[PDB]
Design a protein around this ligand. Sequence first.
Ligand SMILES: Cc1cn([C@H]2CC[C@@H](COP(=O)(O)OP(=O)(O)OP(=O)(O)O)O2)c(=O)[nH]c1=O
Ligand SMILES: OC[C@H]1O[C@@](CO)(O[C@H]2O[C@H](CO)[C@@H](O)[C@H](O)[C@H]2O)[C@@H](O)[C@@H]1O
Ligand SMILES: [Mg+2]
Length: 580
Amino acid sequence: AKMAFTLADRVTEEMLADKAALVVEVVEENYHDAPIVGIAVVNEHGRFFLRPETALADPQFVAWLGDETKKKSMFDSKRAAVALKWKGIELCGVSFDLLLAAYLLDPAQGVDDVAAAAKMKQYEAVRPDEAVYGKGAKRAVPDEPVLAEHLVRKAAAIWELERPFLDELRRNEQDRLLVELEQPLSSILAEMEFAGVKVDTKRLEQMGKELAEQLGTVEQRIYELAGQEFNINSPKQLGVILFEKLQLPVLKKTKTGYSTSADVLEKLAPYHEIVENILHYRQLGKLQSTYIEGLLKVVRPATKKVHTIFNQALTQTGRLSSTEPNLQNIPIRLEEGRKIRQAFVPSESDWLIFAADYSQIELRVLAHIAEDDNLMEAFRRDLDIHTKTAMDIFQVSEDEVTPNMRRQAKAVNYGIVYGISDYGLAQNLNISRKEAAEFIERYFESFPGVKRYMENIVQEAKQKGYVTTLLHRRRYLPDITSRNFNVRSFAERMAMNTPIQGSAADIIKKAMIDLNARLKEERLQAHLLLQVHDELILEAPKEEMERLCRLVPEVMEQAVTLRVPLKVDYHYGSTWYDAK
DNA sequence: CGATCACGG
DNA sequence: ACGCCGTGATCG
Ligand SMILES: Cc1cn([C@H]2CC[C@@H](COP(=O)(O)OP(=O)(O)OP(=O)(O)O)O2)c(=O)[nH]c1=O
Ligand SMILES: OC[C@H]1O[C@@](CO)(O[C@H]2O[C@H](CO)[C@@H](O)[C@H](O)[C@H]2O)[C@@H](O)[C@@H]1O
Ligand SMILES: [Mg+2]
């Protein structure tokens, strides 16, 4: 169609109205220190394209960007706010984010550009980003006339789409979810990303050297026990060595061949001691490629900071994800890998890392939603839920529960409600299927409210076509009412899990908002560095630690009010490792 | 490029 | 058929 706009040479007053759609275009997927390629503004007065050299050097435009009373509608304002922070420019007054609006309406659409959001409301006057920029190796900023139209069309779409999106969100009881939760969170995340996390690169390099030496050792020992050289990192080549050369029993097959999973290898340990060396090599290899080589590749060598990106509009359940680097999967469960955490350090001298974590938040959320008398009682009385379950499924008194029995009970606790089978429980814990089935019966008899939640939540999903979380986030499950046992089954387990995992996401998000408010309120230097699903990581001057110790846990625990209390553990020290 | 494997929640 | 949600390295 025909859409008129001003390809402007200079900023003018009518471009600085107090309500506008604004596009600050960053074409690099990773927007940290990335170029801004163009600016579009659409308001009551018209449509404008501005060259970034010009607009970002203009004191009036920069003031307008920074003024919170001048309201902007955008798509992915976090991308813009961060790219602008790298250029030394503050962005304020973002009142609508089309990306977050589309995400809330349906995460399954995987909306990742203005065009994809526009399609939800049959708005077609805008091209997909991939069509304008090209895919893969063809990725390129087009000629200025083409770029300018594309950006103005994006700004025009946001301008037209705000009301229809807000109208549907309001209808879904998700309007406060957008304006009071996700949008404020976006600003908090932008600050966390830009600040970054400081890394001890010398320590990482030292670990890397040693690891390469252990790797070399374990590798040769594997070749020696196998009587051949092969690529150990090739599950397929490893399959041949284990199941053809060594004639080890084939315990599991996939559509592609023999499994060499950690679980299969565990079950093969009575047969040959090689499998235990292979497990060791894989643990070492992971630390090396992922957490040494990977981290050092992205660290900024002049500041020693890593700058992750929290994807706020990706997961189906309302969790965040973290990329380039992922800081939500740094090792903790085994002591060797946990030491990577010593390389995560305060950004200034005399600062400390502070870490706080919800205790068993998903099971507390389950207690609340299911209204199981027995489960609710456990949390109100501050009992250990994993020990209690152990007592119920092993039919023993409390003192008889072993640390191993607690671990098995933890697997039961995080498995049954989400649809684990007796088979799955038997395979995962390497125990008899008959006993696994008894565990499952005893659990349900001990927590009958949980059995009824599973039945009721699946019924609700079938009747409504979606499930909802505590703060009204939705996930649609069109696959749920199918005759196809597998497709229906996978959808049923999503119905069981999403309300629990998604409600836990809602609670921590609200917690981050409340916390930001107070830190700023009491004018502390403390700020957030990271969120890890049910944990918050901060850094602060050491003097601030007696305050954080009282403030952080309280904000966290009172974020929402449930039919059971929420519990938070917290720790500080001179590295992330030490914050335990 | 989709599976496999390992790491976290 | 066989708990859920993620990212990265690596393979063929
Ligand atoms: C280990 C593991 C964990 N999870 C999720 C669900 C919980 C969170 C946090 O794990 P944690 O051991 O702290 O659990 P928590 O209940 O906090 O137990 P602790 O009191 O920390 O022992 O991770 C899981 O889904 N499957 C697993 O096998
Ligand atoms: O800016 C993050 C935001 O952008 C999207 C696309 O709209 O994802 C892009 O950026 C991510 C972070 O660099 C990449 O991981 C992703 O591959 C890229 O498409 C959204 O998905 C995201 O919320
Ligand atoms: Mg825990």
